[PDB]
Amino acid sequence: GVKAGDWLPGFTPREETVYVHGGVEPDPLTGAILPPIYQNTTFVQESVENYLSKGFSYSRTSNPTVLSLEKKIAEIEGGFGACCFATGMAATVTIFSAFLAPGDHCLVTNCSYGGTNRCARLHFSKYNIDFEFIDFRDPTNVEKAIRPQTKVVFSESPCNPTLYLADIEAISQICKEKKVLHVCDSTFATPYMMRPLDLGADIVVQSTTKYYDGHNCTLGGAVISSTKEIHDKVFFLRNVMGNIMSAQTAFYTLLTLKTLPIRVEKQSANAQKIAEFLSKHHKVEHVIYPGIPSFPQKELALKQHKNVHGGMLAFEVKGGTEAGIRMMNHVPRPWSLCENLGACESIITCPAVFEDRLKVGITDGFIRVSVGIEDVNDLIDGLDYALSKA
Amino acid sequence: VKAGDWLPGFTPREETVYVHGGVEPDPLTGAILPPIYQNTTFVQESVENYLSKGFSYSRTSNPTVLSLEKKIAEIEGGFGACCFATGMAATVTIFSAFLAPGDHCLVTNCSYGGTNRCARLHFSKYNIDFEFIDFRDPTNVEKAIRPQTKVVFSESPCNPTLYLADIEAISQICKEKKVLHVCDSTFATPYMMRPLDLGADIVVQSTTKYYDGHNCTLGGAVISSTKEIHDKVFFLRNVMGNIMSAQTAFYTLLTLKTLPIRVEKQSANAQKIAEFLSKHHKVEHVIYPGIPSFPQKELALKQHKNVHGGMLAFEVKGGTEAGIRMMNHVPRPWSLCENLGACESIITCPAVFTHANMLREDRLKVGITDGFIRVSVGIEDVNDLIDGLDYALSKA
Amino acid sequence: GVKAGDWLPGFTPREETVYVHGGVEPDPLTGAILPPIYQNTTFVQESVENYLSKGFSYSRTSNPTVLSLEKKIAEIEGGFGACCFATGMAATVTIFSAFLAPGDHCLVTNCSYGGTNRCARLHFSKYNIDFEFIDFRDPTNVEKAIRPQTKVVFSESPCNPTLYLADIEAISQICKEKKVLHVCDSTFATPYMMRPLDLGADIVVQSTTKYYDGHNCTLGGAVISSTKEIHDKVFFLRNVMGNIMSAQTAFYTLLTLKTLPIRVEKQSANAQKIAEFLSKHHKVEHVIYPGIPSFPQKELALKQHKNVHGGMLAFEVKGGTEAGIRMMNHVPRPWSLCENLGACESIITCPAVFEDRLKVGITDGFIRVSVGIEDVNDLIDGLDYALSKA
Amino acid sequence: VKAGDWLPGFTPREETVYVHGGVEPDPLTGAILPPIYQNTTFVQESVENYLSKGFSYSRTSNPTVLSLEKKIAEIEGGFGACCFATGMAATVTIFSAFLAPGDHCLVTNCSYGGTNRCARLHFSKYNIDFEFIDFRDPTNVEKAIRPQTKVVFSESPCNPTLYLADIEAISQICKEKKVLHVCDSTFATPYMMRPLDLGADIVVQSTTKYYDGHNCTLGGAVISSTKEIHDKVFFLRNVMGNIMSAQTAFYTLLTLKTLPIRVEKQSANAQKIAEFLSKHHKVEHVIYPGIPSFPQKELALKQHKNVHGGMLAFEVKGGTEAGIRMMNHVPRPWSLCENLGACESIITCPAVFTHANMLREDRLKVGITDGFIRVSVGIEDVNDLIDGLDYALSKA
Ligand SMILES: *Cc1c(COP(=O)(O)O)cnc(C)c1O
Ligand SMILES: *Cc1c(COP(=O)(O)O)cnc(C)c1O
Ligand SMILES: *Cc1c(COP(=O)(O)O)cnc(C)c1O
Ligand SMILES: *Cc1c(COP(=O)(O)O)cnc(C)c1O
Ligand SMILES: *[C@H](C=C)[C@H](N)C(=O)O
Ligand SMILES: *[C@H](C=C)[C@H](N)C(=O)O
C-alpha cells in the first residue's frame, strides 16, 4: 500500500532511473524536487548533548548537497560509500595519502594519467614510497611485480591517453589473493561502461570533471569505497586535508549526472563512426578506439565494456610531429583545441607539444580526441578538412 | 582558416547548433564556456565611447544572456531573441508590446492556463478584447479575424490537451490579413517543430520546461523573425525589467546542449508509455501524437520532426475520484508536481491540482475532462515508469 | 525558559540584529545557518488533498529562498508583506499594472527615476492612464493636483538624480485624507535612512539592485505592502506577469543585506566629506548633498533622514558640458565611470550625455556621484585630479 | 591619464585596496565585477600559441581565482597568493611542500585544532617530527630550532586561547637561523595584523572566517613573500588538486570589500562585550586583547592595528557543567555552532563540542580550561548580544 513519494517495495530501480533519481528525494521541508544548494559553512547545533543530531556541523567535513551527490555516486558505482573532492587529483592524492606510508610499495600502470604519474613520482616518492610503473595489459605482470611491501595496485582503464586496457577482474583476483588494495581510475570508462567495484576493485577513483560533469563546467573528484573501513579512512583524511567538493559543484554534478547515459551513448556512437572514418583515411597512420575491430585489446574490451566503447579515441597523422601540428592548427569549429575531455563539446589535443613519452605510446603527432554530442558529420567534416590541410 | 574558426560558407547541423550555436570561446581567456557576468553595471571607456563595448546595465542587456539569446535565435531560426525571467514574462511582454485598448487578439481556447488567466484577468482590463477559439481548424482563425485584430496567439501542442495547430496554414492566413502570428511551441521544442520555419512571426518559449529539462531554472524566450519586432521586444523588456538573469542564462546554455538527446529519450519513452496505456483496461482514453488513435495524426506527421515529444495525456475510467486515487498512489520515480519537460518524469491532474480553481463546465469545454491526466515523460528507464503507472492504475 | 535557537520572549530585536538575522532562522532540516538555495522550479505534492501543504508548488509563484528574503525585507521596511522581483523596474511596473486602469489618474514626481518616467509615459499611457508629473517638494502641490480619478501618488525621495526630497509624512496625510494610494520609491534612501511605511506610505518600491545589493552583483526589486489586501494584489499580479526574483538573487541579497547598516554609514560619511570638499572647490559650480548646510531642503532632510544623509551626491563643474565631459574623461581609479549606484565601488556619471532635461535640474555638466566605501582620501584625490584637468 | 586608470606612482589606501585591489573592469565588456569563469578548460589559439592567454585548465589556474589571489596578495603585502578549497588545504599544502622525512617543524602548542590533528595524525607518519611549543616567548622558538628545522608555524591570535606571538621577533629568529616562518593570521585578518610586514615568509589564511565573514563559503589562502616560495606553492597546489573554485572566489571577492567595516563593527562590539563580561559575577575569566586584563597587552598594542578583533573568550565559574548549561541556553541572535568571524555571532565551548574527542589533561595543558568558551562577535546590535549572554549566564 505505497503512496506518492514512495518506491515500490522489493523493486531495484533500473539504471537510467538511478542516474535520474538515485541518492536524491524531494526536500522533506518543501517537497522541492531538486536538492537545495546548502551554500553555508556551519550548521547550528540544538544543544551540547544533541551535537550532530542533524548530521552536520562544518562543511569541510560534510555538506548535505555533497552528501546527496556522494550517495548517488556510491549507488551508481556500486560501492559502500563515496567521498567527493574538489578535483580528481585531490581524490587520487587522498588515496595515496591514506593507504601509503614510508617503505610502502605501489604498483601503478605505466600509462596512467600524467597527473597521477607526476604526483606519485615528483611528490609522494619524497616520503620513501616506491612507485613502480609496469604494463597492466598482462595481469600476470602485476602478479609478478607484487612485493611484500606492495600496498596499492593502481590501475586505469581506459588509460589517458593511450586507451590501453587493464583486466580489472583478473587484477582484482590477483590483488585479493595477495591481499593488496586494488584502486582503479575508471574516469575514461564512466560507470555506464564499466564499474570496477563490480569487477572486484577495492576503490574506484573518478574525475567527475570529465564525464560526470560532461559539460566543461566544474572540477571534481570521487573516491568510491567498497567497504566501510576504507570509506571511513577516506572520509577522515578528506576532512583532515580539506579538499572536499563544494556544494555548488555538487549541485552542478547532480544535475549533469542525470543525462550521463544518453550523453555517453551519443558520444560513443559518434566516436565509433569517427574512428571508423579515421581508420579509412589515407592521411592517418594508426587509429586507437576500443570499438574498431583492429583494437589490440579487442577481446578485453568486449569482455569488460558494457553498452559502449566510449567517447575517447586517438590517432596518428602520417608525417610526424610537423603534420600533426599543422593538422592541430587547421581543425575548425565545432572542434575545440584545448585540454580536458568527456564533454558535450568535442575536444582535440596533442600531449607531445601541449623519449620518455614514446615508451608510453604517446608517439609523434599522437592526437587524443574527446568526442562530444555535436552532429557527427560536422565533426567528420572538420577532421577531414584538417587532415587534408596536414 | 586556422583553428577556432567555423569553416566559411558552412552551417552547423542541428545538434551541433544545440552544442555550440551563438557561443564562442572567451576572447580574453579562451574559456570554452562563456563566463557568468554576475555584475550589474559596465564601466565606460569615456563619454564619447559610451557603449563602445556594447553593455552598460544588466537590466537592458547582459553578455551571458546575450550569448544564450544568440544560441536560441540560431536554434529557432529567428532574427533575434530576448530572454525573460519566465515564460509568462515573455507572453506578458508580447501582450504589452503589440496590444492596445480597442485591439483584438485571437487566443487558442485550450491555451496554457497561465496565458488564459493573464489575458482574462489582467490585459482585458485595458479594454483589449481577447477571443478564445478552437485553433484546430485554421478557417476558424480566418473567419474570426476582425479589422482590430493585431495578434493571433497559437499554441502547439496545447497544454494539456495536446491539440495541434497548423502553424503553416495559420501563418498564411495571418500574412494575408497582415496580422502578427505568435506561437507558443513550448511543448514541441525546436527539435520537433520550429514555428518560425512555418511562417510564424514570433515564437514564445517557456525555457523552464525543455530548454532547461532539469527542473532547475525558470525562464522565457521571445524569438523574433524580423529586426523591427525584435527591437520592439527588446525595448519593452528593458522598460518592464523582466530580463533573465545571467546565472539562469548560464544554466540554460548548459542544459540546451543535451536537448536533442534528452528529447529523443523522452519521446521514445513516451511512445512506449502511450502504447502501454492505450491497452490498459482502466484507461478510457490516451492522447499522444505518436499513436494511431491520435485525432490529428495527419497534421502531426506533417508538422512534427524527428519525434512526437515527451508529453502525453490520458483519461482514467471512473472520473475525478478515480483520477485522484491514481494520483495519490503513483510511486517513484514519478513525481506528483507541476512543471513538465524535465529529466524527472512528472504527472499531474489539472482538475484538482492546476484547476481546482476552475468551474467544471468550461473546464470540460476547454477539453480537460474529469479523469484527465497530463504526463511529462523523463529519461528514467521506461520499465520503472510503466510499472509505476500500472500500480497507480491498479489503485484506481 | 528559552533555549538555544529561541529568541527572548517579549524582546523586539534591535535594528542591526534584524539586518543580520531578520526573516531567517537556521534550516530546520540540517541547522544550516544560512538559507539553502532552492534552485529548483517545482515542488512535489504529497497528495491531492495535501496540495500546497508544504507551501510551495511552482517557483514563478513563490520560492522558499525568495520568501525568506521577502520576510526579511518586510521586517526591515516595516510592512505587512513584501514581494521580490527580477528588477526594481519590474516592481514599479507591477505597481502600475495592479493599481491603474484606463481612465485612472496618477501623480508622479517630475524628478522621478528616468526609467519610472519612461515606463509611465511611453508605455502605460497607451492604456489611457494619465500620468501627471509635478513638483513633490511642496506637499500642497500634491494636494492641489489630486483629481477624483487619481488612484496613485508616486513619490521618490531622494530623487534620482536631482536628490530632491518629498515630505513623505505630509504627502501620506494628504493621500489618506483623499483616500488615494501613496507609493514611495525609497531606493536612494534605504530603510536605514528612511522607511516610508513608518511615515504613512501605502506601498514602498525598492530597487534592491542599488543598496540592498550594494555590491554591483545582482538586479532585483521589492514591493513592500502595508496591508494584506495590497500585498495579495501584488502577489497575484507578480505570479501573473512572471517577474519574480530568482532564488540565487534572493540568496545574494540575503547575504548583502546583513552589512547594509555599516555599508551605508561608511558611504554616507565618505559622501559628507566629499560633498564638503566639492563645496569648497573653486572649479565646482553647485554641490547637492542633503548633509551639507546649503542643502535647499535641509529642514526636510533633518526631519526625514535618520542616521545618515546617504551616499548619493551631485555637482556641477564650472564651464558647462565641455568641462564636465573633460572631467568625466579624466577621473582615475578607484572611481568607475558607469551607471548604477549604491555599491561598494564609487561611481560617477553624467546623465546629460549618458531642454526637457533642465527643468528637472539635470543641468549642463550635472554629475551624479554614488559614493562607495573606499578610502575617502583616494576618492577626493581622484576628484581633485579630474577637476584640475577639467 | 584618462578614466579607468590608476594614477601612476600612487598607491590605493587600505580600504580602497579591499574594494578594488587586483581587479579591473572586464577588458571585453567593462563589467565592473570580474565574470565567473565557471568552466573547466580554455581553448588554445594554436600549438605554438599554447598558454598565450595564460589559462588552460582550471585545476592549475582560473581567471576568477587569479583575480582573488591578486587582491589577497595586495592586501596581505606578499609577492603572490594561491587560493585553496579550505584553510586546512592551505596548511596541508604548506606541510606537503616544505617538509620531508627527517625534517623538523615547530608548531605552536595552542594551534588551531585542525592544524594540530593534521600534523599529528597524518604528516608525522612521513617520519616528520612535529614539536609543539609555547610561542608566547620567542626565545622558546629560538632554543628549539634544530639543524633539521625547516618550518616554524606560528598562529596569532591562537585558536581559541587568543595567545599572541611576536611575529617580528620570531621572524628575526627564523631569518637568522634561515628557517621558513609561516604564520596563520586567520584570527587577526590583514586589517589588524599582516605577518608579511613583520618578516614572516608565508601567511596562511582561512578565508572561510573573516575574508568571507558571511558563513557562506570555505576557502584558504597561502600568501608568499617571494617568487620561489610562491612558485613552489603553485606547483604543489596543481599537483594536489586542492584549488579554490571560481564561484567561491567570486563570493570571496564580493565579501572582502566590506572586511574593514565588518571588522570595525565586530571589534567595537567585542570590546563592549568583553568589558561587560569582565564584570559579570558568573564569569571567572575574560580574554580579549582590548581589555586591560589581557596578559599580552604590550604585544597587543605593539602588533595590532586599528582594532583588537572580533574574537574573545571567557571561562565561566562552575566548570564544564555550568558551561554546558550556558551553551544550551544562549538565545538568538546567537548561534551555537562552529566557524567564526562572520556577521552572525557564534559561540562555542571546545571542551564538549570541538574537543569532546580529546583527553582533558593536554586540553588543559593547551590552555582550554573546562568552562572555556570561544566567542566570535558578529555585527548585530551589541545590546541584543549582551542581553543574550546575560540570560545564558543567568542559566549557568
Ligand atoms: C582528468 C583526470 C584526472 C584528473 O582529475 P582532475 O579533476 O582534473 O583533477 C585523473 N585521471 C584521469 C583518467 C583523468 O582523466
Ligand atoms: C510553462 C509555460 C508557460 C509559462 O512559462 P513559465 O516559465 O512557467 O512562466 C507558458 N506556456 C506554456 C505552454 C508553458 O508550458
Ligand atoms: C535603479 C532604480 C530603479 C530601477 O531599478 P532596477 O533594478 O534597475 O530595475 C528604480 N528607482 C530608482 C530610484 C532607482 O535608483
Ligand atoms: C578555520 C581555520 C583553519 C581551517 O580553515 P578551514 O577553512 O576550516 O579549512 C585553520 N586555522 C585557523 C586559525 C582557522 O581559524
Ligand atoms: C503552469 C503552472 C505551474 C506550468 N507551466 C504548468 O503547466 O504546470
Ligand atoms: C575548525 C572546526 C570546525 C574551525 N575552524 C573552528 O574553529 O570551528
**Does residue B276 lie within any of the structural domains?**
yes
Cα–Cα dist D100/D127, whole Å: 8
Whether residue B371 contacts residue B284, with contact meaning beta carbons closer than 8 Å, is answered with yes
> Whose grid coordinates read 531538486?
A34
Cβ <8 Å between B96 and C213: no
Do D148 and D178 touch, CB atoms closer than 8 A? no
Method: X-ray
Instruction: Give SS3 for B4.
Output: coil
Provide CB contacts within 8 A for B37, sequence distance 6+.
Answer: B58, B62, B63, B64, B246, D26, D29, D31, D35, D36
- A247: three-class secondary structure by DSSP: helix
CATH code of D67's domain = 3.40.640.10
Q: Phi-psi region for residue D16, left (φ > 0), alpha (ψ -120 to 50) or beta?
A: alpha
Is C259's CB within 8 Å of D30's CB? no
Contact between B41 and D32 using a beta-carbon 8 Å cutoff? yes
Best residue in C3, C25, C39 to probe A by mutation, most A CBs within 10 Å?
C39
Q: Is C172 annotated as a binding residue?
A: no
B339 with B265, same domain?
yes
Nearest to A116 by CA among A38, A187, A67: A187
Domain endpoint, select from B232, B256, B280: B256
CB B372 within 8 A of CB B389: no
Say if residue D20 is in the same domain as residue D157. yes
What atom of ligand 4 comes closest to residue D206's alpha carbon? Answer: 5
Same domain? For B147 and B232 the reply is yes
Beta bridge partners of B183: B154, B203
* Cα maximum dimension of chain B: 74
Quote the CA–CA distance of A132 and A109 in Å, as a whole number: 8
Is the dihedral angle over the CA atoms A117, A122, A127, A129 positive or is it negative?
positive
**Helix, coil or strand: residue D60:** coil
Q: What is the dihedral of CA A223, A229, A235, A238, to 10 degrees?
A: -80
Other C-beta atoms lying within 10 Å of the C-beta of residue C280: 9
For ligand 1, is residue D241 a contact (CB within 6 Å)? Answer: yes
Q: What are phi and psi of B84, to 5 degrees?
A: -125, 165
Q: Are B47 and C350 in contact (CB under 8 A)?
A: yes
Chain C residues close to D328, C-beta within 8 Å:
3-4
The H-or-E segment that residue B316 falls in is strand B311-316
Write the DSSP symbol of residue C174: H
Q: How many CB atoms lie within 10 A of CB B178?
A: 9
Please indicate, yes or no, if residue D8 is contained in any of the structural domains: no
> What is the stated resolution of the deposited model, in angstroms?
2.3
Q: Cα(A310)–Cα(A190) distance, rounded to whole angstroms?
A: 8
Residue B200 to residues B224, B357, D19, Cα–Cα distance (Å): 9, 33, 50
Q: Are C185 and C156 in contact (CB under 8 A)?
A: yes
Please indicate, yes or no, if residue B9 is contained in any of the structural domains. Answer: no
Q: Is the separation of the CB atoms in D179 and D393 below 8 Å?
A: no
Ligand 3 atom closest to Cα of C209? 7
- Nearest residue CA, atom 6 of ligand 6? D339
DSSP conformational letter for A119: I
Question: SS3 for A128-193, per residue?
Answer: CCEEEEECCCCHHHHHHHCCCCEEEEEEECCCCCCCCCCCHHHHHHHHHHHCCEEEEECCCCHHHH
CA distance A120 to A123: 6
CB D159 less than 6 A from any atom of ligand 4: yes
Residue in D with minimal Cα distance to A50: D328
Q: Which structural domain, as residue segments, surrounds residue C158?
A: 15-255
Same-domain check for residues D151 and D20: yes
**Where do we find the cell 542587456?**
B61
Angle at C324 between CA C322 and CA C325, to 5 degrees: 65
The helix (run of H) or strand (run of E) holding residue D174 is helix D167-177
Q: Give CA–CA dist C238/C260, Å, rounded.
A: 26
Tell me how far apart the alpha carbons of residues A218 and A216 are, in angstroms, rounded to a whole number. 6
Residue D85 exposure: Cα atoms within 13 Å on the Cβ side: 32
CATH number at residue B326: 3.90.1150.10
Residue at B173 is within a domain: yes
B182 to B107, B151, B219: CA distances (angstroms): 10, 7, 18
Query: Are residue D249 and residue D371 in the same domain, yes or no?
Result: no
C3-to-A46, B111, B322 alpha-carbon distances in Å: 9, 54, 49
User: DSSP state, A227?
Assistant: S
Which amino acids bring their CB within 6 angstroms of ligand 3?
Answer: B 59, 241; C 87-89, 113, 115-116, 156, 160, 185, 187-188, 207, 209-210, 219, 221
Same domain, D38 and D77: yes
Work out whether the CA dihedral A289, A291, A295, A296 comes out positive or negative: positive
Contacts of A59 in chain C (CB under 8 A): none
Contact B350, B160 (CB under 8 A): yes
Report which of B380, B303, B318, B385 is spatially closest to residue B349, judged by C-alpha positions: B318
Rounded to 5 degrees, φ, ψ at C65 are -65, -45
Q: Which of D168, D175, D159 is nearest to D195 (CA)?
A: D168
The span from the CA of A66 to the CA of C163, in Å, is 49
Residue B3 lies in a domain: no
Q: What is the dihedral of CA C287, C289, C295, C298, to 10 degrees?
A: 180
Same domain, B60 and B178: yes
Residue B302 lies in a domain: yes
C-alpha cell at D117: 590533528
D159 CA closest ligand 6 atom index:
7
Q: How far is residue A264's CA from residue A275's CA, in Å, rounded to a whole number?
A: 16
Contacts of D266 (CB under 8 A, 6+ apart): D309, D310, D341, D377, D378, D379
Interface contact flag, B59 C219, Cβ < 8 Å: yes
Q: Does a structural domain hold residue D214?
A: yes
Which residue, of D256, D288, D314, is where some domain finishes?
D256
Beta bridge partners, B153, equal B107, B182
With vertex at residue B175, the alpha carbon angle to CA B173 and CA B177, rounded to the nearest 5 degrees, is 70
- Residue C44 corresponds to which amino acid? V
C109 SS3 class: strand
Residue type at position B221: A
Cα separation, D83 vs D68, whole angstroms: 8
Domains in chain B, number: 2
DSSP three-state, residue C58: strand
Nearest residue to B351 (alpha-carbon basis) of B332, B341, B366: B366
DSSP state of C245: P
3-state secondary structure of D36: strand
Q: How many helices (H) and strands (E) does chain A have?
A: 13, 12
Closest CA to C340 of D33, B235, D20: D33
Q: Are D94 and D118 in contact (CB under 8 A)?
A: no
- Alpha-carbon gap, residue D287 to C266, rounded angstroms: 29
Per-residue b/e over C193-220, b at no fewer than 16 CB within 10 Å?
bbbbbbbbbbbbbbbbbbbbbbbbbbbb
Q: Where are the alpha helices (DSSP H) in B256-318?
A: 259-277, 297-303
User: Residue D6 falls within a domain, yes or no?
Assistant: no
Last residue of a domain, one of D208, D241, D256: D256
Q: Report the Cα C107 to chain-centroid distance in Å.
A: 19
Nearest to C114 by CA among C213, C207, C193: C207
Examine the domain organization and report whether D240 and D341 are in the same domain.
no
- Across the interface, do A16 and B332 touch by the CB < 8 Å criterion? no
Q: Is the CB of B271 under 6 A from ligand 2?
A: no
Q: Is C263 annotated as a binding residue?
A: no
CB pairs under 8 A between A and C: 99
Q: What does the angle CA D227 – CA D229 – CA D231 come to, to the nearest 5 degrees? A: 65
Q: Where are the alpha helices (DSSP H) in chain C?
A: 15-21, 64-77, 88-99, 114-118, 139-145, 168-178, 190-193, 228-241, 247-256, 260-279, 298-304, 320-329, 376-389
* CB-CB under 8 Å, D43 with A336: yes
- Point out the residue among C128, C240, C329 whose CB comes nearest to the CB of B46: C329
Cβ neighbour number for residue A53 with a 10 Å cutoff: 11
Burial of B196 (0-12, 13-18, 19+ CB in 10 A): buried
Q: Does B185 share its domain with B298?
A: no
